[PDB]
Design a protein around this ligand. Structure first.
Ligand SMILES: [Ca+2]
Ligand code: NA
Length: 192
């Protein structure tokens, strides 16, 4: 079963009860009997549930951000939190995690190329139809990433720190809009 400690972390990021999480876990074990889900299996979830998208890159990056020990798997806890990160809960409490998403190589700072990589992965989550609710100045990943880097006041070779990333995503709501990683929130912003 689930340790009381894991259950304690799964309510900072979910609102399911202990019994509910345990039932999901039992079902998880039938499909993933090692208690681990691989990157390809995780990607398959996203490919299935985002049919209008090309979600492979996005799902790979989300997976990476949660594979804390880099063993190529997520355990149940990490998988539950990952799904919730992409799909549930309020945005502002996710900003620290978002730093780990954007810091692709895990070296502790974000580079311009890393912003482009993640912006591109998220951009591919936008449907064909919604891709024309895109303003001209924001209609390619290159343009969106360029704007983000500009809002951070950065030169090409500069490194963006965690301190600055959190400040900017809290304070500048245009940075927030552009770095947004939940596909439904990206979609709703494009329409609204
Ligand atoms: Ca980095
Ligand atoms: Na892992």
């Amino acid at each position: 079963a689930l340790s009381k400690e894991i259950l304690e972390e799964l309510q900072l990021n979910t609102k399911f009860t202990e019994e509910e999480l345990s039932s999901w876990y039992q079902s998880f074990l039938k499909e993933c009997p090692s208690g681990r889900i691989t990157r390809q299996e995780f990607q398959t979830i996203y490919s299935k549930f985002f049919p209008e998208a090309d979600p492979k890159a996005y799902a790979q990056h989300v997976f990476r951000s949660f594979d804390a020990n880099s063993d190529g798997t997520l355990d149940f806890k990490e998988y539950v939190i990952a799904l919730h990160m992409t799909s549930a809960g309020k945005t502002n409490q996710k900003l620290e995690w978002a730093f780990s998403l954007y810091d692709v190589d895990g070296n502790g700072t974000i580079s311009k190329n890393e912003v482009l990589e993640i912006v591109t992965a998220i951009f591919k989550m936008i449907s064909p139809e919604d891709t024309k609710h895109l303003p001209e100045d924001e209609n390619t990943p290159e343009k969106r990433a360029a704007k983000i880097w500009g809002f951070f006041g950065k030169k090409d070779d500069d490194k963006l720190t965690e301190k600055e990333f959190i400040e900017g995503t809290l304070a500048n709501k245009e940075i927030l809009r552009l770095i947004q990683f939940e596909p439904q929130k990206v979609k709703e912003k494009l329409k609204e």
